[PDB]
Nucleic acid binder design. Structure first.
Ligand SMILES: [Mg+2]
Ligand SMILES: [Mg+2]
Ligand SMILES: [Mg+2]
Ligand SMILES: [Mg+2]
Ligand SMILES: [Mg+2]
Ligand SMILES: [Mg+2]
Ligand SMILES: [Mg+2]
Ligand SMILES: [Mg+2]
Ligand SMILES: [Mg+2]
Ligand SMILES: [Mg+2]
Ligand SMILES: [Mg+2]
Ligand SMILES: [Mg+2]
Ligand SMILES: [Mg+2]
Ligand SMILES: [Mg+2]
Ligand SMILES: [Mg+2]
Ligand SMILES: [Mg+2]
Ligand SMILES: [Mg+2]
Ligand SMILES: [Mg+2]
Ligand SMILES: [Mg+2]
Ligand SMILES: [Mg+2]
Ligand SMILES: [Mg+2]
Ligand SMILES: [Mg+2]
Ligand SMILES: [Mg+2]
Ligand SMILES: [Mg+2]
Lengths: 210, 46, 147, 102, 52, 203
RNA sequence: GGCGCGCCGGGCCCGGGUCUUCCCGGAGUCGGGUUGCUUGGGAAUGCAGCCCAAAGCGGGUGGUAAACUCCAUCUAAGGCU
RNA sequence: CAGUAACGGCGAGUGAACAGGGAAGAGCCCAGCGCCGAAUCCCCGCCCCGCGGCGGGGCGCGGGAAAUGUGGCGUACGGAAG
């Protein structure tokens, strides 16, 4: 029984909603429990990075977000192989791997290969038994100065290159951008049916040149 | 126990050629049949 | 606060703000938005026109990410870049023209609404409008496409 | 003229340099290895054909390709599986004709 | 019920406006004695002690 | 290896070799009883690819689920209510007869654990399924590391939580866009996550 | 109780790169018809009964049924965490 | 995301997912294809040790399981041999 003027609406309370209501009074108890667990884990993996493994530059999928770079899941096998890192040694020295990632470009692959080489420059690998160092172990000067870095290890921020102020060529001042957009729209829309009409026209050229 | 005497033989012989045999089992038999390393195949009927 | 509401002033008054003749019964016109075609016809004609019925094509698996293309105007095109780029471009006599990347700001399409100040520009957008492009050209400037 | 990279059009998209790696080893599944072809031809020489495909081989022997295709399309499923099974029965029946030839 | 809206949120600049008014009215000696603090022998009212 | 030939031979089922074999097996299985132990699997290759390693402690049963749909267990006609729920005769049951087979096999043997199961025969009025069963308190099972996962209390009566493959096929799960009404742990967990007000502290 | 450390008895005698030759996959299941339930899933999203019931450059997915033709993407019908 | 796409005497009502940000984060093993003299597993008896999660080592011309297939390498991220 609605009043004079006002938004008619569909409230989804026609079910029994009071029996299933999740209230958040343990929100700060949950936050304290999580940060107690985070401090306990971050001190039990004692010099290792608190954030976990390293995760690659990877680019968000869709049309809304492909200008943005995120931190992804794990380094691809192609990336690990170009960086020389064995796919089972990476998870031990602290590198996240997923086998599912493709590589369809070269710019992203070289970005991740550079990131892996930068990580292998930065990390301090302690010896396996401390009294007996080995060849692939970092030196005792920086074994003493190694510690936990907080935050994501080598954080990923979205850097935008700056293009300085050019003068404008008259080719740039005579590029017709709106007509070029609409003409590309029309060509990509009518590409197929023009192909079949060229097919039928050439076939009629066939049937009455033969 | 024949393999046990053979292993004791080579053990104390080192501390001091295999003969041809049947090959049982339908898996091993059909593998060497389809690789043609057999010469006769006896097949149980039941 | 229930200190300030209406049910305090309505103590003693027998009907509590809902009349003696027509009482406060439970649901006299149906639950919710009921009786749309039948007996609230005048409300749904006088206040929500166009409500009943279908119009247009059904798109099944819709994705706002596919249909995403936000807009900037020429009136706020110069907001996107700092003030010292404007005053260096006006101060400059060598004819060098600054490059406004609108996709870095996050707007895919340049529309042309307002006056644009008389400085040569290079607007590096994804899509353009005809009036946005021709106002950029008439000021002097270029329209660069980036996919 | 200037060809800018455009969001629409027939060659739309940001231009990136497509590298060429070998395709992943999940992709080769069901490529016919010669050993499984040998096993499968041995099994067919043991056990022979089904009744619906025998009746389809009678229709293909009388060369009624349309009713043979409609028959296999009903009694198998999709039209793609119908075409594939009709053409392997045509190959089987041609091999039988050549076996009767020489 | 338990799902009464017990908690209220305040805008951050309102909270900071309030913290600045609370600090700035703790220097005006009329506004501290009216709050009631027996204060007449304090040497100056923005009272600063050396951080020893 | 022989098992490739055995699986292609079992694949060809209207071949008259396999029609003769499945017919004579189905005759014998109808002459036998409903829930009886088989001494060794009838399809060793299918058993081995479903989990059976022929060692001590694995048991094959051979069980007979009666074939058909599911008419509604109500008195004479008489579902007392609205005409949507009037129907009794043409109703179908949510779980496969293979899962019902594993269910009553693992009910009849409660000391054992249903690994998986497979098909052996059918006729008009019965279907026959052979069920693979692991005895968890045997030490050839309990000392082997990659099969002592079955000996834990979480895996108690898999066939009744619906966790074997014949039970997982009836819960409507798996990756995809086809399986949106199970995202979460299950279908009920999907529904329960969707139909709750998350009334926050600060709203 | 666990993290520290020593001694005995016992296990394993393990790896990586390149080149050459081999080898590679889960069936009354997939899928189709029909019927009933369920789904926001609409010429049928999922589940099940009955009937048909495969393939191997195959097969599934590519939110409007179907044919043709390119592409893209995974590898089902086994299992643990 | 979204009371959206969609469903619904398209009436009342119903109604997800992708993408993005976070909590957390971990991967793996078979069957098959194979190659290794079944190289494998259980149980009984004795000797030593330890024993209130019956376990470690040795000896049994001790008994079974298993070729209708156990163990070792190997699983789609390919893998094996030389
Ligand atoms: Mg009123
Ligand atoms: Mg009054
Ligand atoms: Mg009133
Ligand atoms: Mg009254
Ligand atoms: Mg009234
Ligand atoms: Mg009246
Ligand atoms: Mg009311
Ligand atoms: Mg009326
Ligand atoms: Mg009703
Ligand atoms: Mg299914
Ligand atoms: Mg029902
Ligand atoms: Mg149901
Ligand atoms: Mg319904
Ligand atoms: Mg698998
Ligand atoms: Mg799986
Ligand atoms: Mg599980
Ligand atoms: Mg909104
Ligand atoms: Mg109506
Ligand atoms: Mg509902
Ligand atoms: Mg998401
Ligand atoms: Mg985090
Ligand atoms: Mg293994
Ligand atoms: Mg083996
Ligand atoms: Mg896989």
């Amino acid at each position: 029984a609605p009043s004079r003027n006002g938004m008619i609406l569909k409230p989804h309370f026609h079910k029994d909603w009071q029996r299933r209501v999740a209230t958040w009074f343990n929100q700060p108890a949950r936050k304290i429990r999580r940060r107690k667990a985070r401090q306990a884990r971050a001190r039990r993996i004692a010099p290792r990075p608190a954030a976990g493994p390293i995760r690659p530059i990877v680019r968000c999928p869709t049309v809304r977000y492909h200008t943005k770079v995120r931190a992804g899941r794990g380094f691809s096998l192609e990336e690990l192989r170009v960086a020389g890192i064995h796919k089972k040694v990476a998870r031990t020295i602290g590198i996240s791997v997923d086998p599912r990632r493709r590589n369809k470009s070269t710019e992203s692959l070289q970005a991740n290969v550079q990131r892996l080489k930068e990580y292998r420059s930065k990390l301090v690998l302690f010896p396996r038994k401390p009294s007996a160092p080995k060849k692939g172990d970092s030196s005792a000067e920086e074994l003493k100065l190694a510690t936990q870095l907080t935050g994501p290890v080598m954080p990923i921020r979205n850097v935008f290159k700056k293009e300085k102020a050019r003068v404008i060529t008259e080719e740039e001042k005579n590029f017709k951008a709106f007509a070029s957009l609409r003409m590309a729209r029309a060509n990509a829309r009518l590409f197929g049916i023009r192909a079949k009409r060229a097919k039928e026209a050439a076939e009629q050229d066939v049937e009455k040149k033969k | 126990q024949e393999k046990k005497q053979r292993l004791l033989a080579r053990a104390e012989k080192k501390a001091a050629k295999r003969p041809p045999v049947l090959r049982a089992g339908v898996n091993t038999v059909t593998t060497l049949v389809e690789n043609k390393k057999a010469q006769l195949v006896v097949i149980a009927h039941d | 606060p229930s200190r300030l509401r209406k049910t305090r002033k309505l103590r003693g008054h027998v009907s509590h703000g809902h009349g003696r003749i027509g009482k406060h019964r439970k649901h006299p016109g149906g639950r919710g938005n009921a009786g749309g075609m039948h007996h609230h016809r005048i409300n749904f004609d006088k206040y929500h026109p166009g409500y009943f019925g279908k119009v247009g094509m059904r798109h099944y698996h819709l994705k706002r990410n596919q249909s995403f293309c936000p807009t900037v105007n020429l009136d706020k095109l110069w907001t996107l870049v700092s003030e010292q780029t404007r005053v260096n471009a006006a101060k400059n006599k060598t004819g060098a023209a600054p490059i406004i990347d609108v996709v870095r700001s996050g707007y895919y399409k340049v529309l042309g609404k307002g006056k644009l100040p008389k400085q040569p520009v290079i607007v590096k957008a994804k899509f353009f409008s005809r009036r946005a492009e021709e106002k950029i050209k008439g000021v002097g400037g270029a329209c660069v496409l980036v996919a | 003229a200037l060809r800018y990279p455009m969001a629409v059009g027939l060659n739309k998209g940001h231009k990136v340099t497509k590298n060429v790696s070998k395709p992943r080893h999940s992709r080769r599944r069901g490529r016919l290895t010669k050993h499984t072809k040998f096993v499968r031809d041995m099994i067919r020489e043991v056990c022979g054909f089904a009744p619906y495909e025998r009746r389809a081989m009678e229709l293909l022997k009388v060369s009624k390709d349309k009713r043979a295709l409609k028959f296999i399309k009903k009694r198998v499923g999709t039209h793609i599986r119908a075409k594939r099974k009709r053409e392997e029965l045509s190959s089987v029946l041609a091999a039988m004709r050549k076996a009767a030839a020489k | 019920k338990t799902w009464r809206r017990w908690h209220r949120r305040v805008n951050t600049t309102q909270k900071r406006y309030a913290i600045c008014s609370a600090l700035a009215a703790s220097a005006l000696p009329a506004l501290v004695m009216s709050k009631g603090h027996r204060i007449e022998e304090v040497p100056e009212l923005p009272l600063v002690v050396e951080d020893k | 290896g022989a098992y490739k030939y055995i699986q292609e031979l079992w694949r060809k089922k209207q071949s008259d070799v396999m029609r003769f074999l499945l017919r004579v097996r189905c005759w014998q299985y109808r002459q036998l009883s409903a829930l009886h132990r088989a001494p060794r699997p009838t399809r060793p290759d299918k058993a081995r690819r479903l989990g059976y390693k022929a060692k001590q402690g694995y048991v094959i049963y051979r069980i007979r689920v009666r074939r058909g749909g599911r008419k509604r267990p109500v008195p004479k006609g008489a579902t007392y209510g609205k005409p949507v729920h009037h129907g009794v005769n043409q109703l179908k049951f949510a779980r496969s007869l293979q899962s019902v087979a594993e269910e009553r096999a693992g009910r009849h043997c409660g000391a054992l654990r249903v690994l998986n199961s497979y098909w052996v025969g059918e006729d008009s009025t019965y279907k026959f399924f052979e069920v693979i069963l692991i005895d968890p308190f045997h030490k050839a099972i309990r000392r082997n590391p990659d099969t002592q996962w079955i000996t834990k209390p979480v895996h108690k009566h898999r066939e009744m939580r619906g966790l074997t493959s014949a039970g997982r096929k009836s819960r409507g799960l798996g990756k995809g866009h086809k399986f949106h009404h199970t995202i979460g742990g299950s279908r009920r967990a999907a529904w329960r996550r969707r139909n709750t007000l998350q009334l926050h502290r600060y709203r």
